[PDB]
Curated annotation (Swiss-Prot), chain B:
Subcellular location: Cell inner membrane
Protein name as annotated: Chain length determinant protein
First and last residues shown, out of full length: 148 to 195 of 326
Name of encoding gene: wzzB
Domain of life from the UniProt record: Bacteria
Function (record text): Confers a modal distribution of chain length on the O-antigen component of lipopolysaccharide (LPS). Gives rise to a reduced number of short chain molecules and increases in numbers of longer molecules.
Family: Belongs to the WzzB/Cld/Rol family.
Quaternary structure note: Homodimer.
Amino acid sequence: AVAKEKWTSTAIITQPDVGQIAGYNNAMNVIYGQAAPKVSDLQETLIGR
Amino acid sequence: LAQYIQQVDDKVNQELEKDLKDNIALGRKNLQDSLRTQEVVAQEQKDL
């Protein structure tokens, strides 16, 4: 009757879709040209950040 | 079980037709722009 209780929530997140960051990926293909990172490498950075 | 397989399959299939429509309608915007900046270059050559 004095002990406070503890409820646990849970969400599961994942690296964004290839079409969600297609505006941001086109920004990195214009300013960098041929040395731009791949879109499968721009997803491990945005979930690394 | 055959309902819960089709339940996840109708969640993935609707999270990809929604994803492709946000990639095509944005992919034809970075091409309608890239035909406008490639046409002003083609008039800097014409003005020369």
